[PDB]
Amino acid sequence: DILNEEAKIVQALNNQRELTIKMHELKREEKDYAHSYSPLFSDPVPQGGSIGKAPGSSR
Amino acid sequence: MLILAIISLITFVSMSKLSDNRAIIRLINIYLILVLVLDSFLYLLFLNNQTYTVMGELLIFNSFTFYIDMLIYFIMIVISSLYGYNLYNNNLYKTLFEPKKELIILFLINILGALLIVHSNDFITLFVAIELQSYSIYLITAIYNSSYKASKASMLYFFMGGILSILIAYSINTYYSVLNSYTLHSLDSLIINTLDLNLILIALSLGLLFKIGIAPLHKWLISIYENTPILITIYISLIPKISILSYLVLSNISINSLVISILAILTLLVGSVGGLLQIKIKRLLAFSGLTNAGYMMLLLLLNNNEFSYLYYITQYSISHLAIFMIIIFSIYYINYINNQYNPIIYVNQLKGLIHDNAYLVLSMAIVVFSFIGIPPLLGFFGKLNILMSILNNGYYFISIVLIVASLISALYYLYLLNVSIQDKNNILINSNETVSSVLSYILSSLIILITFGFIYNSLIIDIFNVYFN
Amino acid sequence: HFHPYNTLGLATQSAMVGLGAGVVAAAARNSLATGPRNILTTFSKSGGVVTIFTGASIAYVFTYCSAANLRERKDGWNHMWAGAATGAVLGARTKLVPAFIGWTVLCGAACGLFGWTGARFNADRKASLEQSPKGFVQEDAHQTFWEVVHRRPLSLTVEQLGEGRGINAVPIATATEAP
Amino acid sequence: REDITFWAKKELDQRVLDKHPEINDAPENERDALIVERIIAGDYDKLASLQKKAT
Amino acid sequence: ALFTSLVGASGLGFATKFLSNKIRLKPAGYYPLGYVFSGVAWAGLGLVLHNVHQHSLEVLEKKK
Amino acid sequence: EHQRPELVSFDDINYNDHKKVREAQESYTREQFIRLEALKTVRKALEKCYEESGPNHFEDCKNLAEQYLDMLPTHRLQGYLGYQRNDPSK
Amino acid sequence: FLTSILLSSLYLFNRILAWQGNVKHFYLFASNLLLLFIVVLYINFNTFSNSFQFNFELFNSLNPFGLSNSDISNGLLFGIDGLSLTFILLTVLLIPLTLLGNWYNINFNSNLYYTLVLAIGLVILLNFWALDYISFYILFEATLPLLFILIHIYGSSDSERASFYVLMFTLSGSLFMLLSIVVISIVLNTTNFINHNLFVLSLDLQTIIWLGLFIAIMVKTPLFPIHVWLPVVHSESPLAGSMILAGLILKLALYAILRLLLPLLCEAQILYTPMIYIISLLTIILTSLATLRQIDLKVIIAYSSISHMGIAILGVCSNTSLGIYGSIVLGVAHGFVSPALFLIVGGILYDRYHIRIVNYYKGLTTYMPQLATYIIILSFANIGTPLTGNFTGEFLSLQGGFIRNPIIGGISCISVLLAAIYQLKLTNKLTGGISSIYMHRTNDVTIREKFIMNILIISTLIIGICPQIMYNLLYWTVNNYIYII
Ligand SMILES: CCCCCCCCCCC(CCCCCCCCCC)(CO[C@H]1O[C@@H](CO)[C@H](O[C@@H]2O[C@@H](CO)[C@H](O)[C@@H](O)[C@@H]2O)[C@@H](O)[C@@H]1O)CO[C@H]1O[C@@H](CO)[C@H](O[C@@H]2O[C@@H](CO)[C@H](O)[C@@H](O)[C@@H]2O)[C@@H](O)[C@H]1O
Ligand SMILES: CCCCC/C=C/C/C=C/CCCCCCCC(=O)O[C@H](COC(=O)CCCCCCCCCCCCCCC)COP(=O)(O)OCC[N+](C)(C)C
């Protein structure tokens, strides 16, 4: 009756250990430009300076 | 909604008389409360560390910065309560704790400039906000101009802030001269390897950091904190610290830096042994801020330091706020009031405080033991979560210097206790007038947070896990 | 392995950097002072600052490289010995024998605690827990530093601890069994 | 009363009565010494049974 | 449980009302209606914190 | 009632379950105590030999005395930790 | 239900403060209720199970105010084995005796004093329940501010320096304890007194971790490099502070070396037991020798407590079942007999004459015959004179220390001589001679002092006549910490 109630607590603590190791993995994982920077306007391509612009200026 | 308050407020304050100033502050107090209560549901925007950039990659809004602005509003509610409410209805405390006409103007302009640093993405937003908050601290220091010490302090702070603003400007344009860019979003993990941005980014961080009071250049700020009056200095000690450190923790440009580690070791050393043989309570109280800013210079070396930072920030803010409010309350019991702006100076003046209002000493003891880092209190988990990040990341000598610095700093924290629990010859029995209900409730709230805030650690870690990861 | 140190030239380089640091600090004390001070009071009213800088520099780097060359390995003990020599040089300005001994032993202990943690102010990158293999081994391998297992090899226990006290290469039970 | 030494002597007696039940039909004080000679004649642990990875 | 959270946060409100009474050099039960005022306010903070943790757990389980 | 719980080893079990680990722990412990009362039984038998023998206890129970002094370095409490932290044959 | 019990109880407390000025009657009542509760728990305790029987979790996220029935657990665990419950029984029968010990001498601000004493007793009660490393550590240093306030407000002339030392040395060792606890919690990502023998660390990671825990144990069971706060924090404390300290804090660190170090630092511990034997022999001999030249009277019993804890540490670090058991018997019997000695010096001798120098006291038999009876009975009980529990602890710890290393066992066996020299040198000075010309005659020992003394003497004599009475708690934990492969 007491071995089962200790195995329950050990399972509940190993669950927290797995959760902690997971939530540590999750932060060091790299992340998208749409999640790290603003979601709308998801491309990093600037295309900036649009009045006196030259054709051939893109690459 | 700060902009609304400033725009409304200077319009309203130009038409009020000087009889109305205190009531105006009360209005603004309640205004800021309903910006916390009715508008904080915006935390739902920042699920799973979703980050926005606003005004064309000009400002950056994540949940870190949302927490920082919530903290700054809470502290401004406390400080504006300290100005807008009477301590007692004597003819004494009216000639001591008196707001100027334009004080709350400069308060809200400084809170604006402090928010536009933590919310900042580009370097010219950083610059314009740094100078907005710097001119506001110049004028908040100089607004009680009928005082020799505050005038001299405002002049000193002007020149020493001017140098360290020109150093930030030099570092920004120096960064621009090697990269046609303003963002540190430009850096993106590969450029740092093939480019020597070490000298640039470290000179930027240093010019930002010498305004906090880090160790080679600490004495001018300790003199400004001793020379300003007792209500001004609780605001100008806290706000540039949390704004500039919340900028430099969010932007990780000094990771594993040797210079920041040298100056962090030196900061922990000179703050711990610097305030040992000191007899003025604001001096004693400012070297505490020097050490507790050292503990942040430690986290500047870190990658992914947002738990340890935010926990120790609201820790230090509540403890700081409470220990200044307790020595506001001890002015009623001292046998000697000098110096109308700064009525208690010497720390031996609170000597018989256990025999007059012993629960003020219970208050004091709680917040001092939390400054030391005693485990039932909230300062312990701040120091603990800083250590869990220092040791995880290889800073082993820094750890032992942290421990020795905390042990040395415990001496002059306990010196406050050692003075206040002592025998005094003439003790109070019966006093006719009462301390402010509104304003002693704030001190009791700040204590109950410190003592019983370890309860919610696991709740806070779970809410952390969802909104920042 | 290791390769022997240039005690000659590292000590010359250290004497150069100590001379320069003494020049800079004497100029700093000149500029930050009161009274009648001129250009050549920089080396008369200096307070003996260049002696501090150069003596500490020569002593620490000579004793460090000599102890690392005499012991033929590199650890924090060389920082202990070199800090003892630096404390000797800093404690001789105190013309007193017990304070001299106190400077020697306590500076050597502080510098040995420094050199044992890695002799770095900052971090080491790959030695960190963040940038190392951690947690359980997922199957059986040489357990690294920062790693945890459930059971250790008994041969590692016999080689690391010994074969003496209560510790044996076969348990007491199966060494005493009926066939 | 509830301890491992009384329980362990009763368990060791029960184990030798398990293996050799012919001691059952000896009379009462002969049973004592027959149990004792069986304890001297044999291990009756099962400790090397537990260390299977050792063997 | 929600009820234990509410009763405990109301106890924190009772503690801050008691301690603010005793800083004022008042008796304990000086103004007895401030006890229910402070308890309702801190219990409302406990209500907010409980609901935010609940929504947080639901977001964490929706990543299955 | 004289209840006899089942015998578990450290080697068949997963260590991530705690039920089986705690039972293997207590099993190895109680087996050391069984070993111990075997040693005590031989000690009481030997002092019965010595008291019944008188002068010739040198030759009546040479073998009982040798048995007691051979069992004594090996029949005691040894601890489960040393076997559960280390595996021989690995 | 359980909330209504408490706000009934808070109203009980408020009404008896409103009608009675003092608290001490209710504090005594709550202490004896706590006694009866712990003995009812001992009735329902299963000795046939190695596991932890009465478990509860506090400050879980799913229920921050109250108990936890959850799939996931990140709060603070609590629960007992026989090893915990031994020290809990020792703690709980000492808390009413320290509340009773200052029943009349504290006059000025009594309610503060009795609240501080009961609060320290409750914190040390919960120290033995804890099951995480962080849950052990939080309660492990909750004592320190209460000790600082207690030693500073109440005491002799020098209570400022004693209050500073009890914060300083304890905090300074225990910060390095926190360093090692942080390293354990970032390697394992679990702090737990249940699982922690299953995890195996590397040998040189273990030998780094073990140092910081052993430095704190060296500060708190004060071994020779820092054994030094202890005579001044004793010699200048009030009575219940001294009694609670030398009966419970030193045995708490003796409990911590079993609970925290021996399960997951086994392969480290074997490499380091010669260094522990250097330090423990060297704190037996040199402290037992430094007691011979002492002018003060409470300082002698402080140094006595050093020498007995030095005997107990080479029992726990002996890798023997005998040594572990003897260290537990020594800790419990010392926690009985030493607060009785601090009562003799601080209660019956400092309440009457208010000086503590040895040179005033001579010939106490002829006016106080039963005090002198107490002094000689307690002196012999403190030495290692058998049928006392102190000899059972000292004998089994010296035997285990002889097994682990016979030469340091041979030079550690002279503690029987060295512990008796200073104790009998004090006792014959106090009892013998013509009555002192400095002391005027006062009352003989009163009923409450004789009551405390009789309890603390019977409870050593019962352990000394039969040490088996608490083997039923310990026979698991005597096998649990042994690493003999
Ligand atoms: C009051 C109490 C004070 C207690 C201070 C103890 C500090 C002692 C530090 C020990 C420690 C940090 C561990 C700390 C963990 C928590 C510490 C808790 C807080 C402590 C504050 C720093 O180890 C340092 O030790 C120094 C000497 O000891 C060295 O000095 C220098 O020596 C010369 C350099 O070449 C220079 O030439 C000389 O200039 C320097 O001098 C340093 O290089 C070294 O980094 C060990 O970490 C390291 O250990 C190694 C070997 O296992 C681990 O190896 C890896 O793993 C295995 C397979 O993968 C392999 O087996 C192994 O081959 C592999 O490489 C690493 O993973 C790493 O982790
Ligand atoms: C109607 C409510 C109106 C809004 C009230 C907001 C006031 C701002 C006050 C700031 C200072 C007071 C401390 C309050 C800490 C709140 C903890 C928290 O929740 O912060 C989170 C975790 O913080 C972290 O990582 C680390 C935070 C560390 C906290 C350490 C102090 C612990 C003890 C004090 C806090 C618990 C007190 C609860 C008392 C019932 C991060 O940000 P969130 O997007 O999830 O915020 C959401 C909060 N909302 C829902 C009320 C808007």
Please state, in angstroms and rounded to a whole number, the distance separating the CA atoms of residues C40 and C28. 13
The β-bridge relationship of strands B59-61 and B52-54 is antiparallel
The pairing of beta strand G56-58 with beta strand G76-78: antiparallel
Whether B421 and G153 have beta carbons less than 8 Å apart is answered as yes
Can you tell me the distance from the alpha carbon of G455 to that of G457, in angstroms, rounded to the nearest whole number?
5
Distances C13 to C19, C84, C115, G114 between C-alpha atoms, Å? 10, 21, 21, 67
Residues 6+ apart with CB under 8 A from F30: D4, D8, D11
- Residue ID of nearest Cα to ligand 2 atom 52: B40
Q: Which two tokens stand for residue B241?
A: 């610290």
Please give the Cα distance from G286 to G224 (Å, whole number): 8
DSSP 8-state code for residue G187? H
**What are the φ/ψ torsions at residue G389 (nearest 5 degrees)?**
90, -35
Helix boundaries (H) for chain E: 2-23, 33-61
Residue whose Cα lies nearest atom 12 of ligand 1: it is: C117
Q: How far is CA G263 from the centre of its chain?
A: 22
What secondary structure letter does DSSP report for B48?
A: G
Q: From CA G333, how far away is CA G256, in angstroms rounded?
A: 18
Sorted by where each begins, the domain ranges of chain E are 1-64
Query: How is chain G split into domains, by residue range?
Result: 1-485
Rounded Cα distance between B52 and B45, Å, is 9
* B303 to C130: CB separation less than 8 angstroms, yes or no: yes
Chains C, G: CB pairs < 8 Å: 50
First to last CA, chain F: 42
Those chains having 3 or more beta-carbon pairs within 8 angstroms of chain F are: A, C, D, G
Classify residue B280 by its DSSP letter. Answer: B
Count other C-beta atoms under 10 Å from residue A55's C-beta.
5
Q: Which bound ligand lies closest to the C-alpha atom of C74?
A: 1
Return the ligand number nearest the Cα of B467.
Answer: 2
- Polymer length in residues for chain B: 469
Of the candidates B158, B151, B140, the residue with the CA atom closest to the CA atom of residue B99: B140
Query: Which pair of structure tokens corresponds to residue B284?
Result: 């004693």
Is the Cβ–Cβ distance between G202 and C144 less than 8 Å? yes
Work out the angle between the directed axes of helices G82-92 and G24-43 (0-180°, nearest 10).
150
Burial class (CB in 10 A: 0-12, 13-18, 19+), F40: middle
Number of domains into which chain B is organized: 1
Q: Is the Cβ pair G475, D3 closer than 8 Å?
A: yes
Say how far residue A15 (Cα) sits from the centre of its chain. 22
SS3 content of chain C, % helix, strand, coil (to 5): 55, 5, 40
- Rounded Cα distance between G478 and G485, Å, is 16
Query: Please, are residues B141 and B341 in contact by the beta-carbon 8 Å criterion?
Result: no
Among G189, G128, C160, G402, which residue's Cα sits nearest to residue F85?
C160
Q: Indicate if ligand 2 lies below 6 Å from the C-beta of E52.
A: yes
E35: CB partners within 8 A, 6+ apart: E13, E14, E17, E18, E29
Cα distance between residue B64 and residue B49, in whole Å? 9
Question: Which letter, b or e, does each residue of B292-319 get, where b requires 16 or more Cβ atoms within 10 Å of its Cβ?
Answer: bbbbbbbbbbbeebbbbbbbbbbbbbbb
User: Is E2 at the interface with chain G, CB within 8 A?
Assistant: no
Report yes or no: B225 and B268 within 8 Å, Cβ to Cβ: no
Are G325 and G277 in contact, with CB atoms under 8 Å apart? Answer: no
Rg (CA), chain E: 16
User: SS3 for D2-53, per residue?
Assistant: CCHHHHHHHHHHHHHHHHCHHHHHCCHHHHHHHHHHHHHHCCCCCHHHHCCC
Detail the DSSP E strand segments found in C46-164. 135-136, 147-148, 152-153
Encoding tokens for residue C93?
């300005």
What single-letter DSSP state applies at residue G164? H
Q: Is there an atom of ligand 1 within 6 Å of C109 CB? A: no
Interaxial angle between packed helices G143-153 and B396-420, expressed in degrees from 0 to 180 and rounded to the nearest 10: 40
Instruction: Judge whether G65 and G45 are in contact, CB under 8 Å.
Output: no
Q: How far is the CA of B464 from the centre of ligand 2 (A)?
A: 10
DSSP single-letter state for residue F75: S
Which of F74, F78, F88 lies closest to C154 in CB terms?
Answer: F88
Q: Is E53 on the interface with G (CB under 8 A)?
A: yes
Which ligand 2 atom minimizes the distance to the CA of B457? 32
G141-175 per-residue burial string, b: 16 or more CB within 10 A, e: under 16: bbbbbbbbbbbbbbbeeebebbbbbbbbbbbbbbb
Out of A12, A17, A21, the one facing G70 most closely (by C-beta) is: A12
Residue C121 CB–ligand 1 contact under 6 Å: no
On chain G, the residues whose CB falls within 8 A of the CB of E28 are 14
B456 is written with which tokens?
Answer: 């919610």
Assess contact for B370 and B448: CB atoms under 8 A.
no
Q: Which residues contact G72 (CB under 8 A, 6 or more apart)?
A: A12, A15, A16, A19, G61, G62
Chain mean position to CA F73: 11
How long, in residues, is chain C? 179
> Could you tell me if A5 lies within 8 Å of chain G, comparing CB atoms?
yes
Helix ranges, G51-158 (H): 82-92, 95-101, 110-127, 133-140, 143-153
- Taken as a whole, chain D contains a residue count of 55
Exposed, middle or buried: residue G189 (CB in 10 Å: 0-12, 13-18, 19+)?
Answer: middle
Q: Which ligand is nearest to the CA of B395?
A: 1
Partners of C135 in the β-ladder: C147
Alpha carbon distance G147, A43 (integer Å)? 62
| Closest to G467 measured CA to CA, from G377, G402, G400, G388 | G388
**Cβ–Cβ below 8 Å for G471 and D2:** no
* Closest by Cβ to G476, choosing from F21, F29, F76: F29
Centroid of chain to Cα B235 = 7
Q: Say yes or no: F37 contacts chain D, CB-CB below 8 A.
A: yes
D40 CB near a chain C CB, below 8 Å? no
Measuring CA to CA, which residue among G143, G145, C130, G180 is closest to residue B403?
G180
Is the distance from the beta carbon of residue C117 to the nearest atom of ligand 1 less than 6 Å?
yes
The amino acid at residue F59 is E
CB under 8 Å, gap of 24 or more: what pairs does G103-111 form? G103/G24, G103/G448, G105/G239, G105/G347, G105/G351, G106/G154, G106/G238, G109/G153, G110/G22, G110/G23, G110/G24, G111/G21, G111/G22, G111/G23
- Please provide residue B52's backbone torsions phi and psi, each rounded to the nearest 5 degrees: -110, 150
CA distance B211 to B163: 10
CA atoms within 13 A on the CB side of B17: 1
Q: Is G471 on the interface with D (CB under 8 A)?
A: yes
Residue F5: DSSP 8-state: P
B412 touches chain G (CB under 8 A): no
Residue G56 phi/psi, 5° resolution? -150, 150
Cβ contacts below 8 Å, chain F against chain G, sum to 50
- The DSSP call for residue G296 is B
**D48/chain C closest Cα distance in angstroms:** 6
Handedness of CA C144, C146, C148, C153 (dihedral sign): positive
- Alpha carbons within 13 angstroms on the beta-carbon side of residue B323 total 28
Q: Give the H/E segment covering residue G11.
A: helix G2-19
State the Cα–Cα distance between residues G2 and G67, nearest whole angstrom: 11
DSSP H or E run through F86: strand F86-87
Q: How far is G472 from chain D (nearest CA, A)?
A: 6
Flag whether residue E25 sits within 8 Å of chain B, measured between CB atoms. yes
Residue B92 to residue B337: CA distance in whole angstroms:
10
Provide the angle, in degrees to the nearest 10, between the axes of the packed helices E33-61 and E2-23. 140
What is the rounded CA–CA span in Å between residue G254 and residue B87? 51
Tokens describing residue B250: 């969010």
Nearest Cα to Cα of residue D50 among F84, G264, C178: F84
* HSE of C152, CA atoms in CB hemisphere, 13 A: 28
The pair phi, psi for residue G423, each rounded to 5°, is -70, -45
B395 vs C: CB within 8 A: yes
Cβ-in-10-Å burial (0-12, 13-18, 19+) of G433 comes to middle
Contact G85, G46 (CB under 8 A): no
- Per DSSP, the three-state class of C135 is strand
Q: Cα(C104)–Cα(G173) distance, rounded to whole angstroms?
A: 24
DSSP letters for B59-72: EEE-HHHHHHHHHH
> Residues B293, B267: contact at Cβ < 8 Å?
yes
State how beta strands C152-153 and C147-148 pair. unpaired
Q: Which two tokens stand for residue F37?
A: 């009362």
Distance CA G195, CA G182 (A): 17
Q: Does D2 reach chain G within 8 Å, measured CB to CB? A: yes
- Residue B265, CB half-sphere, CA atoms under 13 Å: how many? 16
The full length of chain F comes to 90
Closest CA to B447 of B326, B270, B327, B285: B326
The C-alpha atoms of residue B139 and residue B107 are separated, in whole angstroms, by: 10
Rounded (5°) CA angle G44-G50-G56: 60
Tell which atom from ligand 2 comes closest to the C-alpha of E52.
50
Q: Nearest Cα to B99, choosing from B81, B77, B84?
A: B84
Of all protein residues, the one whose alpha carbon is nearest to atom 5 of ligand 1 is: C117
C118 CA → ligand 1 middle, Å: 6
Measured between beta carbons, the chain D residues lying within 8 angstroms of F4 are 11, 14
Using only the alpha carbons of chain F, give its radius of gyration: 18
Q: Checking DSSP bridges between strand B52-54 and strand G76-78, what pairing results, if any?
A: unpaired
Which structure tokens are listed for B167? 């150093």
**Cβ contact (<8 Å) for B462 and E16?**
no
User: C-alpha distances in angstroms, B43 versus B48, B249, D35, E58?
Assistant: 11, 20, 77, 16
Which ranges of F1-90 does DSSP label H, i.e. alpha helix? 18-53, 57-60, 62-71, 81-84
| Cα separation values, B41 from B35, B76, B209, Å | 11, 20, 33
CA of G208 to the centre of ligand 1 (A): 10
Distance B116 CA to ligand 2 centre (A): 21
Q: Which two tokens stand for residue G223?
A: 């071994």
> CA angle at residue G461 from G459 to G467, to 5 degrees?
90
3-state secondary structure (DSSP) of residue G105? coil
Q: And the tokens for G59?
A: 């400050």
Nearest CA, atom 40, ligand 2 = E46
* Residue carrying the six token digits 């799913």: G62
Dihedral in degrees, nearest 10, Cα atoms G13, G15, G16, G20 = 140
| Under 8 Å between Cβ of G57 and G30 | no
What 8-state DSSP symbol labels residue C2? -
The kind and range of the H/E element at B118 are: helix B103-118
Query: In a mutational test of the pocket of ligand 2, which residue from B75, B311, B314 has the highest number of ligand atoms less than 8 Å from its CB?
Result: B314
For residue C42, which of C56, C58, C62, C24 has the smallest C-alpha distance? C24
> How many angstroms separate the Cα of G305 from the Cα of each of G125, G165, G247, G298, G330?
21, 18, 9, 11, 11
- State in Å: Cα B463 to ligand 2 middle: 9
Return the best residue to mutate from B68, B70, B366 for the ligand 2 pocket (most ligand atoms within 8 A of CB).
B70
Residues with Cβ within 8 Å of residue F25, at least 6 apart in sequence: F80, F84, G50
Long-range residue pairs from C124-128, CB within 8 A, at least 24 positions apart, any chain: C124/B394, C125/B256, C125/B394, C127/B394, C128/B392, C128/B393, C128/B394
Ligand nearest to the CA of C117: 1
Q: CA neighbours within 13 Å on the CB side: how many for G349?
A: 24
CA-CA distance, G102 to G117, in Å (whole number)?
10
DSSP state of E56: H
Exposed/middle/buried for D43, CB within 10 Å: 0-12, 13-18, 19+?
middle
Question: Do C99 and C83 form a contact (C-beta atoms < 8 A)?
Answer: no
Residue G310 CA, ligand 2 centroid: distance in Å: 49
Report, in this order, helix, strand and coil percent for chain B, each rounded to 5: 70, 0, 30
Give the 3-state secondary structure of residue B381. Answer: helix
Evaluate whether G364 touches G431 at the Cβ level (below 8 Å).
Answer: yes
Amino acid identity for residue B306 in this structure: E
**Residue for token pair 């207590």:** F26
For residues F48 and D54, is the Cβ–Cβ distance under 8 A? no
- At a CB cut-off of 8 Å and minimum separation 6, what does B368 contact? B323, B413, B414, B416, B417
Residue with tokens 């013309």: C95
List chain G residues with CB under 8 Å of C136: none
Burial of B95 (0-12, 13-18, 19+ CB in 10 A): exposed
Matching residue, tokens 């609590």: G78
Burial A16-48 (b: 16+ CB within 10 A, else e): bbebbeebbeeeeeeeeeeebbbeeeeeeeeee
Asked if D12 contacts D18 with a C-beta cutoff of 8 angstroms, the reply is no
C83 lines ligand 1 (CB under 6 A): no
Contact across the interface for G188 and C148, Cβ inside 8 Å: yes
**What does the alpha-carbon distance between residue E49 and residue E5 come to, in Å, rounded to a whole number?**
9
Q: Tell me, in angstroms, the distance from the centre of ligand 2 to residue B221's CA.
A: 31
